[PDB]
Amino acid sequence: TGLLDGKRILVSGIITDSSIAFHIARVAQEQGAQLVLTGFDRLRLIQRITDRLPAKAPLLELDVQNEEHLASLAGRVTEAIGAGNKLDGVVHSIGFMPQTGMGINPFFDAPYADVSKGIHISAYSYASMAKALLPIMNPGGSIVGMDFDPSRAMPAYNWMTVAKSALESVNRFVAREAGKYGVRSNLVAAGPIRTLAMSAIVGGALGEEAGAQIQLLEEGWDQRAPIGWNMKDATPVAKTVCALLSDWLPATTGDIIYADGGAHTQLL
Amino acid sequence: TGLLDGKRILVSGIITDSSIAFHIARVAQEQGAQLVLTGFDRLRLIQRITDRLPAKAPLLELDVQNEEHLASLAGRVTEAIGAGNKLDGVVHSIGFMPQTGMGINPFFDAPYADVSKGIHISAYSYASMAKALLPIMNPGGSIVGMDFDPSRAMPAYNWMTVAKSALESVNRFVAREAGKYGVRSNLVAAGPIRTLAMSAIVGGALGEEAGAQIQLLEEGWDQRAPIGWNMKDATPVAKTVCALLSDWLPATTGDIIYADGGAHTQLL
Amino acid sequence: TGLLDGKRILVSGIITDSSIAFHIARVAQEQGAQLVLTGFDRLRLIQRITDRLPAKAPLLELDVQNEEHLASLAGRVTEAIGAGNKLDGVVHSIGFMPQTGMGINPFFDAPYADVSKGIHISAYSYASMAKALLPIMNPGGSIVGMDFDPSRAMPAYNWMTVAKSALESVNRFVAREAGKYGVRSNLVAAGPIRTLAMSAIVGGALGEEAGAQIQLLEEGWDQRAPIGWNMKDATPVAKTVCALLSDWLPATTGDIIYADGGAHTQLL
Amino acid sequence: TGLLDGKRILVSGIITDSSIAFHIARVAQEQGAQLVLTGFDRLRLIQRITDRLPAKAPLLELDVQNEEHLASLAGRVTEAIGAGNKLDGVVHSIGFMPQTGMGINPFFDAPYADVSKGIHISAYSYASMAKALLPIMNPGGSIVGMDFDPSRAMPAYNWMTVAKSALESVNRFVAREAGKYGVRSNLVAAGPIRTLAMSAIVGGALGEEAGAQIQLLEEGWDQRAPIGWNMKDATPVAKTVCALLSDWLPATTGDIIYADGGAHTQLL
Ligand SMILES: NC(=O)c1ccc[n+]([C@@H]2O[C@H](COP(=O)([O-])OP(=O)(O)OC[C@H]3O[C@@H](n4cnc5c(N)ncnc54)[C@H](O)[C@@H]3O)[C@@H](O)[C@H]2O)c1
Ligand SMILES: NC(=O)c1ccc[n+]([C@@H]2O[C@H](COP(=O)([O-])OP(=O)(O)OC[C@H]3O[C@@H](n4cnc5c(N)ncnc54)[C@H](O)[C@@H]3O)[C@@H](O)[C@H]2O)c1
Ligand SMILES: NC(=O)c1ccc[n+]([C@@H]2O[C@H](COP(=O)([O-])OP(=O)(O)OC[C@H]3O[C@@H](n4cnc5c(N)ncnc54)[C@H](O)[C@@H]3O)[C@@H](O)[C@H]2O)c1
Ligand SMILES: NC(=O)c1ccc[n+]([C@@H]2O[C@H](COP(=O)([O-])OP(=O)(O)OC[C@H]3O[C@@H](n4cnc5c(N)ncnc54)[C@H](O)[C@@H]3O)[C@@H](O)[C@H]2O)c1
Ligand SMILES: N#Cc1ccccc1Oc1ccc(Cn2cc(C3CC3)nn2)cc1O
Ligand SMILES: N#Cc1ccccc1Oc1ccc(Cn2cc(C3CC3)nn2)cc1O
Ligand SMILES: N#Cc1ccccc1Oc1ccc(Cn2cc(C3CC3)nn2)cc1O
Ligand SMILES: N#Cc1ccccc1Oc1ccc(Cn2cc(C3CC3)nn2)cc1O
């Protein structure tokens, strides 16, 4: 009955109930998966959100910049799921860029220390999570991360575009390592979804040229998309992630699936 | 229980039991679809093959070069599935190129009449089938065709590479038309599968440089693919097609999903 | 002094003085090339235009659909340039699509016969010209054709987009054949230039949705382009073609150079 | 007579006489440019090499990790070329990755601190140099950096592939900033050239699987390239860079020109 019946999947990146990861985790549990959740920094907060999913799931702390957390992680998950059981799926739904790197702030004024921090959390950590978790994954497993098509430059996204270009390259190497375990690694490139991280791109703060540019970009999606795009509904994205976590894309790895209404296939 | 439970899907392109389309049709019926089949030219032949699928399905004649067949097609399908019912899925699994266009024959010696015939069957017919069938498709439906990545040139494939480049462009326009109906249009770019059409690329005929080049290309797939590639098993491809026909890639259109072991993501 | 000093170059595709090919031919002669021109159908017409170039050049008839013209072509050029001399450069600046294939006319209503005619002139003829001319080209030579980026679908361009996707694939195979002669083959993907062929896309005829879509597309170029885009000035395109015809891009073949203000590198 | 007659161009990245930058600087001076050179760390060393170029040129110290050097740089160049003169060209020919990030060392064992250092020097510094130099560039100027196509993963190149993916994204944003000054920004993606940095990829050290993989990759270039590829001759690459620095690619920005024999256009 359930697409992910009987699979065990770690989902990272839940912060609010608008989190792409929250909707992935929801759809996963509806399709019969058993989850382990990771949260960063505001754990009691995340737990209250995570209490609203259709089923219970252990929650564990994971700051991908923290080397001890990364080192304990597989042993912690193993404790959460039972000795002798492994993970079938891993979702990386995580990103960060300091405010200098994005929004109004000129591109050339972002210090390297801030860019470097963004690339660590947004790109490198895809490899670091795979490293920590591949040893406790089953053949036929699936690792999925979240992308925003960075093939072309665009206003405001600035250094996060750079970090996504890195992530895509990183995903291609993760696939070479994951292959040795019989495990696939892919990214889902989503269209714009109203989340907390999307509210932080300007720094919210108001009436600046970059805010207008951002509204114009985001409206372009629904226009260009042959099937339309609803920024208010993360479900089509969540479903696509679940497609990859299942056994129905068994020959796809090192790759990017576009859950964007087909917008990236159309110029106008 | 079934991924395609309760959907009605037309599959074209069955000629033998190695046909990519045969394995799509098989997997579809295992996942609860109800099929309508199309066959070209050797109908009694196709019928004997189609008798070995797990369930029965009406078979109809469709030469995509035949304008009367294309004109009657929707009315014929409607008769096969019941007045008041529509198609949820369409699979285009069809191609052709005259022998001058491919194999040993020099690229520059292919007459336009032969190239033109190949592009008609291999590319144009994706639009012509969509034209004929979109009026009898349901919102939320899916059209899928079969591609072989033509982004780079390669030995022997010659004008069929050209025809696949056309098909990709054609698919992007089909998506704009299909959108009006709430229907997606996508291609699956497969790795090499041993089928009848694959036996015809040299013209089989033997010990020529192009035959060796073709064997070297085909071995490269399994090497470059992080998860490996088995040319003997069309199932992973069939499954991927079924992924697209389902409701689990709801935001993907005008696009290409690579069922090739990840080979196209790796240089070596 | 002259970039193309002492080279001999065939330029096709001059119809008016706005023709991309006219500006290629002009810039070529300013940089010291010696030209041979080809014209289709309105030869006395073309000759009057060609009389306004900075220097004289023989003009020859070439309908790329005409097999006798293609067969005589190398012998005709050889007569025009002297026994014992060869071509160093070839410019394909040629395209056509019947009115059903483009503009207002729905995509699905274009008959195959018309599409096929467009692909013959717009794509296939790049191979047919190379075939006819490679035997009379010098090592270190250059073949260049003209593209309009067809990676994504767009309004109105319709089947000509398909024909350009084909051309790109064709160019990649032409490069494999041309390599044997020490000759490169490339396309220049230009931004929109006001030419005769651009006036014919709607069929000119007025106030239809597709006309507006076309004006919106064309304005997007200058906005997205970091250095701007002037649709009134073919010179930057002509210069780029001359770059490829010279000895300064000696390691580039099977490829596409974008003379579009950088518009294709920017989403918004 | 000279392609770059009367232009003033800064070239970074000369370390030995095999340096891609050395051959760019040579070809530039043959075509009449006047140069300013930058060197990192071994200045007396670089100076002896730079003494063998056809003409003299001031040399200045530039570690792109050093913020004071970056801050003084424009004022230093201005002193070297004369108050009231500006730069017409900038060449970034610079990269670095610590040994953990590349060669034999497993991909997952590269610490972030080392990756981060590589991305700082190899990618970020393209923006930092543009920042420092755009204020002293002339309209119609050109910034060029050096790439190695990272679209697909490959053995050994590991984190430097990631850094090149970043660089490509960075170049697209640099083009948006450079546009405001009438200046283009592009990368040249070169085929493999025997340089010092190429000797350091394994760490030279011997008979390991990755060494063989690297030799197999490098031989693939000359095979796949329609015009061949000579790893011993940086001139075709140098010429391509000079093409971009000239006025003959005036409409190309945010982009990548492939000086790789056409290898990236061919699968086999
Ligand atoms: N919302 C969109 O339009 C959109 C589109 C495409 C891709 N994405 C990507 O989707 C993913 C999820 O973002 P979202 O939009 O759902 O937003 P969000 O704010 O819901 O989620 C971002 C998550 O990153 C986590 N995070 C930040 N730093 C961390 C660290 N050090 N360690 C671990 N977790 C950390 C936060 O805790 C949060 O849970 C990201 O990779 C984002 O770039 C978003
Ligand atoms: N086998 C591979 O390695 C491979 C890989 C990628 C894509 N493909 C594509 O997959 C599709 C199916 O080919 P296959 O390899 O399974 O081979 P096949 O020989 O099994 O199938 C080709 C089908 O095309 C049909 N056909 C030809 N001309 C027709 C016409 N006028 N009208 C209708 N049907 C017509 C034939 O009847 C046959 O059923 C094609 O588009 C092919 O290019 C094949
Ligand atoms: N103008 C643009 O915005 C633009 C942009 C990118 C690419 N292009 C391409 O540039 C090339 C030149 O077009 P243009 O815009 O300068 O227009 P045009 O109308 O100046 O040139 C088109 C040429 O094609 C020729 N032609 C048509 N059918 C022919 C045949 N049977 N044999 C030989 N010649 C034939 C015409 O005689 C004419 O000289 C084409 O390939 C076009 O698709 C145009
Ligand atoms: N050789 C190839 O096959 C090849 C192919 C494509 C691209 N590339 C790229 O070409 C460029 C030049 O490399 P090369 O192969 O000619 O090698 P190289 O070793 O000749 O040049 C690398 C240069 O980087 C400089 N450098 C390193 N760290 C620096 C820093 N902190 N600040 C300033 N300079 C610093 C070194 O001093 C040296 O001059 C690089 O970007 C390289 O990645 C090389
Ligand atoms: N997590 C996270 C995150 C961190 C820094 C920047 C953005 C982040 O999440 C995203 C949120 C939204 C989008 C999509 N998007 C970009 C834009 C405008 C160009 C800024 N609008 N929507 C992409 C994202 O990576
Ligand atoms: N149907 C069909 C068809 C028609 C003409 C040529 C090939 C056809 O089917 C295919 C069969 C196999 C492949 C994959 N492929 C290409 C090659 C060698 C380069 C020729 N080997 N495997 C691609 C196909 O389009
Ligand atoms: N030659 C020729 C030609 C033949 C059919 C269609 C167009 C032709 O020339 C072009 C003329 C202009 C353009 C650029 N373009 C497209 C468009 C709108 C989308 C139709 N506007 N500018 C591209 C071209 O191939
Ligand atoms: N500079 C520099 C540099 C720094 C770290 C790594 C390589 C560097 O220069 C390169 C030297 C050679 C190549 C081309 N290449 C890669 C490879 C094998 C896959 C490692 N062989 N040739 C690409 C380069 O970026």
The residue among C27, C25, C33, C31 whose CA lies nearest residue C7 is C33
* CB-based contact A153 C217, cutoff 8 Å: no
CA C176 – CA D155 distance, rounded (Å): 26
CA of A214 to the centre of ligand 6 (A): 44
* CB-based contact C267 A213, cutoff 8 Å: no
- Around Cβ B39, how many Cβ atoms within 10 Å? 22
Torsion sign over Cα B185, B190, B195, B201: positive
CA D102 – CA D104 distance, rounded (Å): 7
Find out whether D181 and D141 touch, Cβ atoms under 8 Å: yes
- Around Cβ A42, how many Cβ atoms within 10 Å? 12
Phi first, then psi, for residue C55 (nearest 5°) are -140, 160
Cβ-Cβ contacts under 8 Å, C266 against chain A: 152-154
Rg (CA), chain B: 18
CA C240 – CA C258 distance, rounded (Å): 9
CA B46 – CA B14 distance, rounded (Å): 7
- Around Cβ A216, how many Cβ atoms within 10 Å? 11
Q: How many CB pairs under 8 A join A and C?
A: 32
Cβ-Cβ contacts under 8 Å, A265 against chain B: 172, 175, 253-255
Cβ-Cβ contacts under 8 Å, A69 against chain D: none
3-state secondary structure string across chain A: CCCCCCCEEEECCCCCCCCHHHHHHHHHHHCCCEEEEEECCCHHHHHHHHCCCCCCCCEEECCCCCHHHHHHHHHHHHHHHCCCCCEEEEEECCCCCCHHHCCCCCHHHCCHHHHHHHHHHHHHHHHHHHHHHHHHEEEEEEEEEEECCCCCECCCCHHHHHHHHHHHHHHHHHHHHHHCCCCEEEEEEECCCCCHHHHCCCCCCCCCHHHHHHHHHHHHHHHHCCCCCCCCCCHHHHHHHHHHHCCCCCCCCCEEEEECCCHHHECC
Find out whether B13 and B21 touch, Cβ atoms under 8 Å: yes
Q: Quick check: CB of D263 below 6 Å from ligand 8? A: no
Q: Where are the beta strands (DSSP E) in chain B?
A: 8-11, 34-39, 59-61, 87-92, 137-147, 184-190, 255-259
CA A101 – CA A107 distance, rounded (Å): 7
Question: C40-62 b/e with 16+ CB inside 10 Å = b?
Answer: beeeeebeebbeebeeebbbbeb
The residue among B161, B165, B169, B126 whose CA lies nearest residue A267 is B169
* CB-based contact D267 B217, cutoff 8 Å: yes
Q: Report the half-sphere exposure of B88 (CA within 13 A, side-chain side).
A: 17
Atom of ligand 4 nearest to the CA of D19: 20
Atom of ligand 6 nearest to the CA of B96: 4
The residue among D71, D80, D72, D67 whose CA lies nearest residue D37 is D80
Torsion sign over Cα C10, C13, C15, C19: negative
Q: Which numeric CATH code is attached to D1-268? A: 3.40.50.720
Element spanning D245, H or E: helix D235-245
Tokens coding C260: 């579009």
Q: Quick check: helix, strand or coil at residue B34?
A: strand
Name the β-bridge partners of B8.
Answer: B34
Expressed in angstroms, the distance from the first to the final Cα of chain D is 40
Domain segments of chain B as ranges: 1-268
Nearest CA in chain A to B1: A1
* CB-based contact D254 A153, cutoff 8 Å: yes
What technique determined this structure? X-ray
- Around Cβ D253, how many Cβ atoms within 10 Å? 31
CA D118 – CA D162 distance, rounded (Å): 10
Q: How many CB pairs under 8 A join B and D?
A: 32
DSSP label at residue B159: H
Q: Interface of chain A against chain D, CB under 8 Å?
A: 106-108, 112, 115-116, 119-120, 123-124, 127-128, 130-131, 150, 152-153, 158, 161-166, 168-170, 172-173, 175-177, 254
Element spanning B165, H or E: helix B158-179
Ligand nearest to the CA of C220: 7
The residue among C220, D176, B165 whose CA lies nearest residue A223 is C220
Q: Quick check: helix, strand or coil at residue D207?
A: coil
The residue among D91, D85, D89 whose CA lies nearest residue D183 is D89
CA of A185 to the centre of ligand 6 (A): 27
Partner residue opposite A153 with nearest CB, options D120, D161, D173 = D173
Q: Quick check: helix, strand or coil at residue D256?
A: strand
Expressed in angstroms, the distance from the first to the final Cα of chain C is 40
* CB-based contact C265 A220, cutoff 8 Å: no
CA C62 – CA D161 distance, rounded (Å): 47
Find out whether B170 and C162 touch, Cβ atoms under 8 Å: yes
Q: Quick check: CB of D65 below 6 Å from ligand 4? A: yes
* Chain D nearest CA to A1, separation (Å): 37
Find out whether A9 and A245 touch, Cβ atoms under 8 Å: yes
DSSP alpha helix (H) spans, D36-148:
43-50, 67-81, 112-119, 125-133
Name the β-bridge partners of A114.
Answer: none
Find out whether D163 and D97 touch, Cβ atoms under 8 Å: yes
Residue carrying the six token digits 């890639």 = B249
CA A84 – CA A78 distance, rounded (Å): 8
- Starting at the edge strand found earlier in the chain, the sheet holding C87-92 runs C59-61, C34-39, C8-11, C87-92, C137-147, C184-190, C255-259
CA C171 – CA C254 distance, rounded (Å): 6
Q: Report the half-sphere exposure of A33 (CA within 13 A, side-chain side).
A: 31
Torsion sign over Cα A205, A210, A215, A218: negative
The residue among C64, C60, C78, C58 whose CA lies nearest residue C137 is C78
Name the β-bridge partners of D7.
Answer: none
Is B232 part of any known ligand binding site? no
Tokens coding A195: 């989340």
Name the β-bridge partners of B11.
Answer: B37, B91
Tokens coding B154: 């390669």
Name the β-bridge partners of B256.
Answer: B187
CA B261 – CA D62 distance, rounded (Å): 45
Question: D78-95 b/e with 16+ CB inside 10 Å = b?
Answer: bebbeeeebbbbbbbbbb
Dihedral in degrees, nearest 10, Cα atoms B232, B238, B239, B243: 150
Residues with CB under 6 A from ligand 5: A 95-97, 102, 148, 154, 156-157, 160, 192, 197-198, 201, 214, 217-218
CA C194 to chain centre: 14
CA A171 – CA A180 distance, rounded (Å): 15
* CB-based contact A124 D108, cutoff 8 Å: no
Residue carrying the six token digits 């996204």 = A157
The C-alpha angle with vertex A19 and arms to A18 and A21, in degrees rounded to 5, equals 135
Dihedral in degrees, nearest 10, Cα atoms D235, D240, D241, D242: 90
DSSP label at residue B38: E
DSSP label at residue B191: P
Counting other chains too, the contacts that B82-86 makes at CB distance below 8 Å and 24 or more residues apart are: B85/B8, B86/B8, B86/B136, B86/B137, B86/B138, B86/B141
Interface with B, mutate which of A253, A256, A268 (most B CBs under 10 A): A253
Tokens coding C73: 């072509």
* CB-based contact A115 D124, cutoff 8 Å: yes
Tell me the pairing of strands C8-11 and A184-190.
unpaired
The C-alpha angle with vertex B28 and arms to B22 and B32, in degrees rounded to 5, equals 140
Residue carrying the six token digits 């014209």 = C39
Cβ-Cβ contacts under 8 Å, D256 against chain A: none
Residue carrying the six token digits 């990859």 = A244
CA of A37 to the centre of ligand 2 (A): 45
Find out whether C228 and D251 touch, Cβ atoms under 8 Å: no
Partner residue opposite C155 with nearest CB, options A155, A265, A268 = A268
Cβ-Cβ contacts under 8 Å, A264 against chain C: 152
CA D40 – CA C121 distance, rounded (Å): 54
CA of C163 to the centre of ligand 6 (A): 21
CA of A233 to the centre of ligand 1 (A): 16
DSSP label at residue B263: G
DSSP string, D105-118: S-GGG--HHHHHHH
Residue carrying the six token digits 């947004």 = A122
CA D236 – CA D24 distance, rounded (Å): 10
Q: Report the half-sphere exposure of A73 (CA within 13 A, side-chain side).
A: 29
Tokens coding A170: 């990183």
Q: Interface of chain B against chain D, CB under 8 Å?
A: 152-155, 213, 216-217, 220, 264-268
CA A205 – CA B101 distance, rounded (Å): 61
> Which residue has the CA at smallest separation from atom 20 of ligand 3?
C19
Torsion sign over Cα C68, C70, C71, C76: positive
Find out whether B266 and A260 touch, Cβ atoms under 8 Å: no
Cβ-Cβ contacts under 8 Å, B181 against chain C: none
* Chain B nearest CA to C60, separation (Å): 23
- Around Cβ C109, how many Cβ atoms within 10 Å? 10
Phi first, then psi, for residue C25 (nearest 5°) are -55, -45
CA C244 – CA C260 distance, rounded (Å): 16
Phi first, then psi, for residue C103 (nearest 5°) are 80, -125
Ligand nearest to the CA of D196: 4
Residue carrying the six token digits 């796949």 = D224
Residue carrying the six token digits 């950088």 = C262
- Starting at the edge strand found earlier in the chain, the sheet holding D8-11 runs D59-61, D34-39, D8-11, D87-92, D137-147, D184-190, D255-259
* CB-based contact D257 C246, cutoff 8 Å: no
Expressed in angstroms, the distance from the first to the final Cα of chain A is 40
CB neighbours of B187 closer than 8 A, spacing ≥ 6?
B144, B145, B146, B147, B167, B168, B171, B255, B256, B257
Phi first, then psi, for residue C261 (nearest 5°) are 70, 10
- Burial of residue A75 (CB within 10 Å: 0-12, 13-18, 19+) is exposed
* Chain D nearest CA to A219, separation (Å): 22
Question: A89-101 b/e with 16+ CB inside 10 Å = b?
Answer: bbbbbbbbbbebb
* CB-based contact B152 D265, cutoff 8 Å: yes
The C-alpha angle with vertex D137 and arms to D133 and D139, in degrees rounded to 5, equals 145
* CB-based contact D267 B213, cutoff 8 Å: no
CA D244 – CA D237 distance, rounded (Å): 11
* CB-based contact D255 C239, cutoff 8 Å: no
Phi first, then psi, for residue A73 (nearest 5°) are -60, -50
Residue carrying the six token digits 């001058």 = B100
The residue among D24, D168, B217, B249 whose CA lies nearest residue A258 is B249
CA A260 – CA C131 distance, rounded (Å): 43
Letter for the amino acid at D210?
A
Cβ-Cβ contacts under 8 Å, B267 against chain D: 152-154, 217
3-state secondary structure string across chain C: CCCCCCCEEEECCCCCCCCHHHHHHHHHHHCCCEEEEEECCCHHHHHHHHCCCCCCCCEEECCCCCHHHHHHHHHHHHHHHCCCCCEEEEEECCCCCCHHHCCCCCHHHCCHHHHHHHHHHHHHHHHHHHHHHHHHEEEEEEEEEEECCCCCECCCCHHHHHHHHHHHHHHHHHHHHHHCCCCEEEEEEECCCCCHHHHCCCCCCCCCHHHHHHHHHHHHHHHHCCCCCCCCCCHHHHHHHHHHHCCCCCCCCCEEEEECCCHHHECC
Find out whether A241 and A9 touch, Cβ atoms under 8 Å: no
- Burial of residue C187 (CB within 10 Å: 0-12, 13-18, 19+) is buried
Query: How many residues comprise chain C?
Result: 268
- Burial of residue C107 (CB within 10 Å: 0-12, 13-18, 19+) is buried
Tell me the pairing of strands B255-259 and C34-39.
unpaired
Is B24 part of any known ligand binding site? no
- Burial of residue B214 (CB within 10 Å: 0-12, 13-18, 19+) is buried
Give whole-number Cα distances, D224 to C191, D2, D258, in Å: 30, 33, 14
Tokens coding A212: 């207008």
Is A64 part of any known ligand binding site? yes
Tell me, in Å, the resolution of the deposited structure. Answer: 2.0
Q: Quick check: CB of D40 below 6 Å from ligand 8? A: no
Phi first, then psi, for residue C148 (nearest 5°) are -135, 115
CA B26 – CA B87 distance, rounded (Å): 18
Letter for the amino acid at D144?
V
Atom of ligand 5 nearest to the CA of A154: 19
Tokens coding C262: 């950088």
Would residue B251 be called left, alpha or beta, if left means φ above 0 and alpha means ψ between -120 and 50 degrees? alpha
The C-alpha angle with vertex A112 and arms to A159 and A63, in degrees rounded to 5, equals 75
CA C150 – CA D110 distance, rounded (Å): 40
Tokens coding D236: 């075709």
- Around Cβ B72, how many Cβ atoms within 10 Å? 16
Q: How many CB pairs under 8 A join A and B?
A: 131
DSSP string, D139-197: EEEEEEEEE---SSB-TTTHHHHHHHHHHHHHHHHHHHHHHTTT-EEEEEEEPP---HH
Neighbors of chain B by Cβ distance (3+ pairs < 8 Å)? A, C, D
CB neighbours of C133 closer than 8 A, spacing ≥ 6?
C10, C73, C74, C77, C87, C90, C143
Q: Quick check: CB of D64 below 6 Å from ligand 4? A: yes
